[PDB]
């Protein structure tokens, strides 16, 4: 009896389980690095820290490209901006300019810390009005980080109730919904196989974002003054005029897309990580208690938390690290591409090949982490409890090398201060129908969590101390 001709083969079911996990499970059979061919395109998945660092750092330049995707073409206006732009002059310039802008916020009058604390104050005052009630903290937190990133991009913010905030939220949700069904990584390109309206819907949401950004740029062409460079838009406009090989790379569209990447990332990443952190604390009341104890003893109630408090609030800084391990914002980073013929772990990799780092695998490798599927912030502390440690070399929440996260400083500060101020001021408890958030998650371009509610109450201790 003969065997059928095989015209296709995939190692697991599509749309069943999470991609990053399915790739991980495959490592038991096939090892830490393997490939899949889809028509013409070849993709390599890497799931061990040694090989990953070779791709991100040692041979960083070789693998610093980004593959092209139809959905991403639309969001990025054909591969402009930073995150989805191929390696090249545009990417390098705009990335550099964006980084240079965060320097303008490291100290002084417009210090990043104060900008953030300003908006966390408004957030806390608003949340306190919901004393006694169960609520979804998504929108209130969304506003807070939106204002922070707006101040950094334009030196503007939004008053309570500005409906432009509801507009942004709508298109943010719609774009994220249609940019990918699940992860950006998608074995079969269903998009091109069956008739569908994904690109149509995606365009309609992107159009609204772009119209709003254009509106902002046009209104700002007048307020721009050369001697005063205080925000990201200033920096980008100052560069364009400074010419005078550089000027074609700073068109209006190049500038808006870059601002768009920053505005989007600044808001959806940090918002997501905050929700994830709360969710874990509702599942782990023992940890939560230890965090209240820690903050009462090291900051108390006579002032509000500041960045310098990260030197004393160690369990908090560790809790954040452990969320970023267990539920990475980008569990498969963003896809990389080989710019040139090269190699990984002595295996050949052709120019143009897609390369994916399975960070989830790195963060859950059993030989590198003790009980990796557990939420244990303790692992990032010495046994004493008195200083932070790095227990594994297999940890890269913000990536590394040329395409590493450029918003890391901002993220870490936003996350630390938000959690700090909330814990000082609020009991955050399971709602009265004792529903706990699902920790399973929803993979999109970002690793999101199902919406959930939290009962919020002002703390007796915080009240007494007024």
Asked if 446 touches ligand AER (CB under 6 A), the answer is yes
- Taking the least distance from each CB to ligand HEM, the nearer of 364 and 455 is 364
Residue 273 binds which entry of ligand AER, ligand HEM, none, CB below 5-8 Å type-dependent: ligand HEM
DSSP three-state, residue 333 = coil
Closer of 44 and 83 to ligand HEM (Cβ) = 83
257 binds ligand HEM (CB under 6 A): no
Q: Does 139 bind ligand HEM (CB under 6 A)?
A: no
CB atoms within 10 A of CB 41: 12
The DSSP call for residue 435 is P
Among 168, 278, 405, 448, binds ligand HEM (CB under 6 A): 405
What is the spatial distance between Cα 20 and Cα 22, in angstroms, rounded to a whole number?
Answer: 6
Strands 41-46 and 354-357: parallel
152 binds, among ligand HEM, ligand AER, none (CB under 5 to 8 A by kind): none
| Contact flag: residue 404 with ligand HEM (CB under 6 A) | yes
Measured from the Cβ of residue 157, the count of other Cβ atoms closer than 10 Å reads 17
Q: Which stretch binds ligand HEM (CB under 6 A): 36-44, 239-247, 366-374, 398-406?
A: 398-406
Minimum CB distance to ligand HEM, residue 277 (Å): 10
* Cα–Cα dist 196/382, whole Å: 53
Q: Which does 175 bind (CB under 5 to 8 A by kind): ligand HEM, ligand AER, none?
A: ligand AER
Q: Apex CA 99: angle with CA 415 and CA 144, to 5°?
A: 30
Residue 45 in contact with ligand AER, rule: CB under 6 A: no
Bridge partner list, 448: 442
Contact between 82 and ligand HEM (CB under 6 A)? Answer: yes
Stretch touching ligand HEM by CB under 6 A, among 12-20, 164-172, 265-273, 449-457: 265-273
270 binds, among ligand AER, ligand HEM, none (CB under 5 to 8 A by kind): ligand HEM
Which of the listed partners (ligand HEM, ligand AER, none) does 260 bind, with a CB threshold of 5 to 8 Å by partner kind?
Answer: ligand AER
**Pair 305, 420: CB distance under 8 Å:** yes
Work out whether 273 is an interface residue with ligand HEM (CB under 6 A). yes
Q: Are the CB atoms for 102 and 409 separated by under 8 Å?
A: yes
Shortest Cβ distance from residue 209 to ligand AER (Å)?
Answer: 5
Rank residues 172 and 424 by Cβ distance to ligand AER and give the closer one.
172
DSSP per residue, 260-321 = HHHHHHHHHHHHHHHHHHHHHHHH-HHHHHHHHHHHHHHTTTSS---GGGGGT-HHHHHHHH
Q: Say whether 178 counts as a known binding-site residue.
A: no
Which SS3 state, helix, strand or coil, does residue 434 take? Answer: coil
Q: Is 104 helix (H, G, I), strand (E, B) or coil?
A: coil
Interface positions with ligand AER (CB under 6 A): 83, 171-172, 175-176, 209, 260-261, 264-265, 268-269, 329-330, 405, 445-446
């Amino acid at each position: 009896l003969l065997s059928l001709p095989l015209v296709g083969s995939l190692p697991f079911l599509p749309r069943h389980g999470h991609m990053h996990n399915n790739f991980f499970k495959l490592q038991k059979k096939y090892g830490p690095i393997y490939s899949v061919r889809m028509g013409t395109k070849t993709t390599v998945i890497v799931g061990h820290h040694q090989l990953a660092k070779e791709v991100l750092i040692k041979k960083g330049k070789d693998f610093s490209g980004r593959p092209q995707m139809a959905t991403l073409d639309i969001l990025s206006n054909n591969r402009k901006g930073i995150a989805f732009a191929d390696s090249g002059a545009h990417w390098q310039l705009h990335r550099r300019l964006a980084m240079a802008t965060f320097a303008l916020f490291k100290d002084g009058d417009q210090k990043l810390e104060k900008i953030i604390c300003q908006e966390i104050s408004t957030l806390c005052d608003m949340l306190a009005t919901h004393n006694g009630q169960s609520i979804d903290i998504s929108f209130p937190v969304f506003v807070a980080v939106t204002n922070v990133i707006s101040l950094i991009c334009f030196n503007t913010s939004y008053k309570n109730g500005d409906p432009e905030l509801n507009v942004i939220q709508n298109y943010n949700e719609g774009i994220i919904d249609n940019l990918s069904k699940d992860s950006l990584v998608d074995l079969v390109p269903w998009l091109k196989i069956f008739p569908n309206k994904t690109l149509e819907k995606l365009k309609s949401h992107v159009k609204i974002r772009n119209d709003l950004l254009n509106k902002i740029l046009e209104n700002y062409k007048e307020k721009f003054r050369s001697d005063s460079i205080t925000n990201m838009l200033d920096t980008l406009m100052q560069a364009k005029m400074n010419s005078d090989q550089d000027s074609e790379l700073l068109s209006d569209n190049h500038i808006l897309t870059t601002i768009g990447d920053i505005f989007g990332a600044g808001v959806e990443t940090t918002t997501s990580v905050v929700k994830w952190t709360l969710a874990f604390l509702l599942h782990n009341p023992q940890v939560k208690k230890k965090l209240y104890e820690e903050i009462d003893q090291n900051v108390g109630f006579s002032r509000t938390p500041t960045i310098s408090d990260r030197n004393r609030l160690l369990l908090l800084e560790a809790t954040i690290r452990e969320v970023l391990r267990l539920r990475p914002v980008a569990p498969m980073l963003i896809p990389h591409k080989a710019n040139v013929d090269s190699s990984i772990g002595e295996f050949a990799v052709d120019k143009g090949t897609e390369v994916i780092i399975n960070l989830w695998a790195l963060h859950h490798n059993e030989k590198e982490w003790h009980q990796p599927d557990q939420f244990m912030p303790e692992r990032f502390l010495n046994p004493a409890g008195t200083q932070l440690i790095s227990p594994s070399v297999s940890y890269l929440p913000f990536g590394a090398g040329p395409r590493s996260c450029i918003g890391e400083i901002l993220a870490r500060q936003e996350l630390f201060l938000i959690m700090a101020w909330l814990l000082q001021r609020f009991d955050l408890e399971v709602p009265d129908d004792g529903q706990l958030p699902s920790l399973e998650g929803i993979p999109k371009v970002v690793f999101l969590i199902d919406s959930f509610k939290v009962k919020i109450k002002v703390r007796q201790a915080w009240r007494e101390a007024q």
